[PDB]
Design a protein around this ligand. Structure first.
Ligand SMILES: [Zn+2]
Ligand SMILES: [Zn+2]
Length: 145
């Protein structure tokens, strides 16, 4: 059978600065100032994806060290999940295209969809996100912890 790589598995730290095309994305995707703040300034994002051997699901954890905006959940490929933040529901489905993780997101209350892709090779991860026709790109470095 096929050898498979999932290079997005691991822990990741956002590189210094704002995502590529951030200004345009903020405007088009109508990112509120409260959400903007988490990606502006010295604030880091930590992202962790993992799979334990004997389970049929993946785990994800995001944290913004210094703040209380954390997320921790599990998902199965192709199966819908729902998350909520400050009373706003987000529906998502994760899939794979070869080595790339794809997350399709819908926010019904805003009539807004986002697609996020995670493309990694070795110590580097590119997170591409598109919403309302505008694409931003954020880079992360692999970290041990
Ligand atoms: Zn588990
Ligand atoms: Zn929050």
């Amino acid at each position: 059978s096929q050898w498979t790589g999932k290079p997005w598995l691991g822990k990741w730290e956002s590189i210094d600065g704002t995502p590529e095309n951030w200004e345009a994305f903020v405007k088009a995707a109508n990112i509120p100032p409260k959400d903007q703040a988490l990606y502006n300034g010295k604030q880091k994002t930590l992202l962790k994806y993992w799979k334990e051997a004997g389970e049929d699901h993946y785990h994800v954890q995001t944290s913004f060290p210094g703040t209380e905006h954390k997320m921790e959940t599990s998902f199965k490929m192709g199966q819908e999940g729902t998350l909520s933040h400050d009373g706003v529901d987000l529906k998502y489905v994760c899939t794979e295209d070869g080595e790339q993780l794809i997350t399709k997101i819908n926010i019904p209350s805003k009539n807004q969809e986002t697609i996020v892709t995670y493309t990694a090779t070795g110590d580097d991860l590119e997170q591409t996100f598109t919403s309302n026709g505008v694409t931003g790109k954020r880079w992360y470095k692999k970290i041990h912890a």
